[model samples]
Target: SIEFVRIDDRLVHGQVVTTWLKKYDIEQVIIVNDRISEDKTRQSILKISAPVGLKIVFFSVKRFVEVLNSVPIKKRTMLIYTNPKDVYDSIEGNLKLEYLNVGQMSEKVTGGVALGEEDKYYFKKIVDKGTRVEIQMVPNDKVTMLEKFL
Candidate 1:
């Protein structure tokens, strides 16, 4: 089953390796990002950053939805997406999940994209489906509900 869904620009990083993984007790880390899925260097970096015994996999958003149901229901998995669009698409694709987290969205990618305005609809859709949404930058950060950002 899904432990959580996080929308973090940096899929696998220091904070993720040292914080969220242990905090959530996640068994599997699934990264849904088109670019990162195909990038060998980044994949290598992610694998290296991951602690021993942790399972990590990369998938494009489309492929993730396709294979999602096949993933073991008993495994605690953390789904990580790079942007709101990917999260929105997953919802549209009917990905079964329980929690949605907004980790970080950098200023460079904020141009022309009204993340707040667009995510308002997506957040409501997710919540309407009984999924909770929150903004948690790291394990130690104050986790603000996404509604507050809306």
Candidate 2:
């Protein structure tokens, strides 16, 4: 089963290897984002960063949803995504999940994109679906409910 679902722009870095992975005892990792899924170098870096012997897989948001149900949950798994759009799209594509943790995502506005404005807009939709949304950059940090910030 998916023990945790996190939105972290720094997908698998020092903090993840040292803290979150052990916190969940995550047996497998599924990165559901378009950028990393398609980029071989990014995938390689992520693979090298994580602890050895742990399973890690990459998938595009759309492909992940396509295979979500079929993927067996025999071991603890953490689903990682980069941003709200990917998270929202996965849900909209019918990927069932329990909750979401918003990690360190910078709201640097992209040209023609309003991340600051739309981040919560999409998250609001996710919450409306009965999934709890909260912010906690790391395991020790207190979880601040997404609504408080909204």
Question: Which prediction has the highest lDDT against the true structure?
Answer: 2
**What tens-digit string does per-residue lDDT give for candidate 2 at 89-114?**
88888777678887767654322222
TM-score of 1: 0.79
Model 1 residue runs over 4 Å out of place are 71-73, 107-130
Kindly list the per-residue Cα lDDT of model 1 for residues 1-150, writing each as its tens digit: 778888877767765444887887889888899998889999999898887868898998888878865655567888888677677778777786677877776512222223655666776667777777777777777776765544
Candidate 2 clashing pairs?
none
Task: Please name the candidate that would achieve the greatest TM-score relative to the true structure.
Answer: 2
lDDT of 2 at 26: 87
Off by over 4 Å in 2: 107-115
Model 1 residue 135 CA deviation (Å) reads 0.7
Task: Supply the global lDDT for candidate 2.
Answer: 0.78
